[PDB]
Amino acid sequence: GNSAEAWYNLGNAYYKQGDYDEAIEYYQKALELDPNNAEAWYNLGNAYYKQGDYDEAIEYYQKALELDPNNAEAKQNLGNAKQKQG
Numbered sequence: 001g002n003s004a005e006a007w008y009n010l011g012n013a014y015y016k017q018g019d020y021d022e023a024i025e026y027y028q029k030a031l032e033l034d035p036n037n038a039e040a041w042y043n044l045g046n047a048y049y050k051q052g053d054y055d056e057a058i059e060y061y062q063k064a065l066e067l068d069p070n071n072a073e074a075k076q077n078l079g080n081a082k083q084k085q086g
Helices: 002-016 020-033 038-050 054-067 072-085
Strands: none
Touching (some): 002 020, 038 072, 054 072
């Protein structure tokens, strides 16, 4: 939706600044408004990944993949994250 997509794009802008704490806040807001945005789950996963929070990265990649099984980057980063944590 209108607001949801704009919060998502805000999270993307902060992610591209390397400001992962902020990106997470804004992606969380996006997902509250539209939990069906698979790409937002995936980028939230990436933000946690960049912060070394691999358990969280995994949960969010798995959610992204539930909604969009063919997101190859999610699948790849999930695998990476699982190797890091276990």
